[PDB]
Amino acid sequence: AKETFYITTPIYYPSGNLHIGHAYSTVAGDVIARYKRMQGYDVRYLTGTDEHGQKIQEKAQKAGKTEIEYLDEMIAGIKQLWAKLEISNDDFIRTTEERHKHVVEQVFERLLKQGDIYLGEYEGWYSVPDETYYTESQLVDPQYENGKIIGGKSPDSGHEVELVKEESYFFNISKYTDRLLEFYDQNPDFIQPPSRKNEMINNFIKPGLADLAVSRTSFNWGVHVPSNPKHVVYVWIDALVNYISALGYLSDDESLFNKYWPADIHLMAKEIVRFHSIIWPILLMALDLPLPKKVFAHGWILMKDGKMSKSKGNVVDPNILIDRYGLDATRYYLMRELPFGSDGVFTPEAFVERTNFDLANDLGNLVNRTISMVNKYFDGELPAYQGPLHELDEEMEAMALETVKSYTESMESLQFSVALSTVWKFISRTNKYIDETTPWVLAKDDSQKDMLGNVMAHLVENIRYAAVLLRPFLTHAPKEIFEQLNINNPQFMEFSSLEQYGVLNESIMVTGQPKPIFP
Ligand SMILES: Nc1ncnc2c1ncn2[C@@H]1O[C@H](COP(=O)(O)OP(=O)(O)OP(=O)(O)O)[C@@H](O)[C@H]1O
Ligand SMILES: Clc1cn2ccsc2n1
Q1: Which residue ranges does the UniProt annotation give for the motif 'KMSKS' region?
Q2: What is the phi/psi pair of residue 148, to 5°?
Q3: Cβ(269) to ligand 2 under 6 A?
Q4: How far apart are CA 483 and CA 511, in angstroms?
Q5: What is the DSSP string of 332-350?
Q6: Which residues does residue 11 pair with via DSSP β-bridges, in sequence order?
Q7: Is residue 310 a known part of a binding site?
Q8: CB 314 within 8 A of CB 345
Q9: Nearest bound ligand to CA 10?
Q10: Whose CA is nearest to atom 4 of ligand 2?
Q11: How distant, in Å, are the alpha carbons of 157, 224, 338 from that of 299?
Q12: Would you kindly state where each structural domain of the chain is located, as residue ranges?
C-alpha cells in the first residue's frame, strides 16, 4: 500500500572526529526521512562509515594502533553522536562488516568474469587525503627536477599528491559514456542543483573518461580480490557499494534490495558528486541494476579559512553545541542557517541569535503567553473553536493554509531554510495577533467573552500548525507543546490535520504549570 522511499547519507571516513558539516548532512537526511514518514511513505534511511583505504590506515598508524581497534573506538563515538542527534536511521553500515565485504568481492569477481575489468598498469598521481587519481597536467604548483615533474598538489584540495606506478585492475568506464549521457537526457532532475550537472559534463565527461584503476597492490587495508589476493579494491568502488550491500544485494536475502532499490535520494556535499553521478551509475549499468533517481549535493559549512575539514582542523564539534545549548537548538541552526545550494559561514554569534530569538523567544514565549492567558481568563479551560469571528481571522486562517502550501513546496525541493523561515513568518504573525486583538482589553468587558474565547482558540490552533510542521526538524519541542496544550488525539499531530483550520472544537484543559519548552 505505502510507496517506498530510500534515502542515504555518504559513508563518512572515520579519519578524525566528525564536525558540524557531517552533522548537517545527517540531520538533513533525517529531516527528509521524518518528513516522508509523516507523508505516509515506507521510509528506509541509511548512514555509515567508509573504513578502508590508505587514508584510514594512515590515521590508525598515526594513532599507534591497528586499523580495527582504531576503527571500533571511532565508530563507537560516531554511533553515540547520531543517538545524541536523534537520527532516525534504520541501519548503520560499516565497510569492515562481512555482509559488505562479501558484496564487494562478488561485484569485483562478476565484472572480472564479464571482462569489464582487466589487469594492467597504472602510472600517474594519487592524493591519499582525497583518495583520487590525477594526471600530470591536473597538478597544481608542480615541482620540476631536471625537466620532469616529480611532485605537486591536488587541484581539488591543495594536498600533496604522490607518484604511483604499479600493477592495477582497470574498469573500462569509457564504453558506458554514451549511455550515461542518454540517461542524463532522459532524467533531467538527476543531479541537484542544476549547476553541478554542467560541472560534471564539461569538466569530466566531455574531455574524455579515462579507464578507472579499480584496484591496487601497494597497501593491504581493504577488500582483497579473491582471484588475485595481492590486489586491494579501490576505496571508492568499495564505498559506493554500501548503498546496495546494506539492502542484502547478492546475499541469501535480497528482500530489502527488491523493495527499496533504486534509491530516491543520495545526499552529499559537492566534492563527491563525480563519484555518485559518473562512476556510480556506470557501475550499476555494468551490474544491470536500476540507477538512483536523484543525487543531491549541498554546499559547505565555511569557517574563517574556507571549507570546514577534519583533516585541516578548523572545526566545530556538535557534542559541544548539544551539551551546552541543547538538541533542538543544534538541529534548528544547521537547517535554518545553511541554505542547501549555498556555502554558509559558521559564527557562534549567529548560533546564539537563532537559539535565543527564534526558538526561546519567538516560539517558546508565544506558547507561554498563550497558556498564561487561558489560565488567567478561562481558568485553564480553552474554549472550543467555532469560526473566524474576529475581523482578522479570515485572513489569518488563509495564511495558515498558505504557510502549509509554501512549506510543502520548499520541503519537496529540499529548501529547508526557506521552509523554516516560512514557519517563522507564521509564528511571528501569531505573536502580532496577540498585540492586534489585545485580549486583556476584551477580558474587561463581559459582553466580549465569546470574542475572547475565539482569540484564544486561534492562538492555540496557530501554535498547533507550527508544532506539526516542526516535527521533522525538532525532536523535543513539538512533543512538549502538545503535552502542555493537552492535545492527545494522535490525528491532530499529523500533516492531514492541517488541511482544514480549527480542529479543536471541544473545550480542553491546558497545563496549569506552564514551563519554558526550550533549554
Ligand atoms: N564543511 C562541510 N559542509 C558540509 N558537509 C560536509 C562538510 N565536510 C564534510 N561534509 C559531509 O561529509 C562528506 C565528506 O566526508 P569526509 O569523510 O570526506 O569528510 P571531510 O571533513 O571532508 O574529511 P577530511 O577532512 O578528512 O577530508 C560530505 O560529502 C558531506 O556529506
Ligand atoms: Cl559512498 C561514500 C564514500 N565516501 C567517503 C567520504 S563521504 C563518502 N560517501
Answers
A1: 307-311
A2: -80, 145
A3: no
A4: 8
A5: HHHHHHS-TTS-EE--HHH
A6: 48
A7: yes
A8: no
A9: 2
A10: 11
A11: 15, 34, 8
A12: 1-115+236-346, 116-235, 347-519
The partner residues of 297 in beta bridges, in order of sequence, read 268
Whose alpha carbon is nearest atom 6 of ligand 2?
12
The C-alpha atoms of residue 478 and residue 462 are separated, in whole angstroms, by 13
Spatial distance between the Cα atoms of 341 and 317, rounded to a whole number of angstroms: 23
Of the ligands numbered here, which is closest to the C-alpha atom of 297? Answer: 1
Residue in this structure with the C-alpha cell 542543483, named with its chain if needed: 193
Counted residue by residue, the chain has a size of 519
CA-CA distance, 316 to 323, in Å (whole number)? 13
Q: Strand 344-345 to strand 91-94: parallel, antiparallel, or no bridges (unpaired)? A: unpaired
Question: Would you say 94 and 51 are in contact if contact means Cβ atoms under 8 Å apart?
Answer: yes
Separation between Cα atoms, residue 365 and residue 371, nearest integer Å = 10
Contacts with 515 (C-beta within 8 Å, 6 or more apart), sequence order: 484
Q: Give the integer Cα–Cα distance in Å for 215 and 217.
A: 7
CA 283 from chain centre, in angstroms, equals: 24
- What determination technique applies here? X-ray
Ligand nearest to the CA of 56: 1
Vertex 54: Cα angle to 65 and 180 (nearest 5): 145
State how beta strands 42-49 and 91-94 pair: parallel
Going by C-alpha positions, the residue among 293, 287, 297, 424 that lies closest to residue 364 is 424
Sign of CA dihedral 25, 30, 35, 39: positive
Distance CA 238, CA 106 (A): 11
Residue among 365, 377, 368 at smallest CA distance from 453: 377
Atom of ligand 2 nearest to the CA of 131: 5
Distance, CA of 263 to CA of 292 (rounded, Å): 5
Paired residues of 332 in beta bridges: none
Q: Coil, strand or helix: which one is 216? A: strand
The reply to whether ligand 2 has any atom less than 6 angstroms from the CB of 501 is no
In the chain, the amino acid numbered 131 is E
Q: What 3 state SS string does 358-371 have?
A: HHHHHHHHHHHHHH
Pseudo-torsion of CA 460, 466, 472, 474, nearest 10°? -80
- Classify residue 296 by its DSSP letter: E
Number of other CB atoms surrounding residue 225 within 10 Å: 22
Amino acid at 429: R
Report the amino acid identity of residue 60.
A
Compute the distance from residue 332 Cα to the ligand 2 centre, in Å: 25
Angle subtended by helix axes 318-325 and 20-38, to nearest 10 = 70
Q: Is residue 119 within a helix (H) or strand (E), and if so which, with residue range?
A: strand 117-127
Dihedral angle computed from the Cα positions of residues 277, 279, 284 and 288, in that order, rounded to the nearest 10 degrees: 120
Residues 6+ apart with CB under 8 A from 97: none
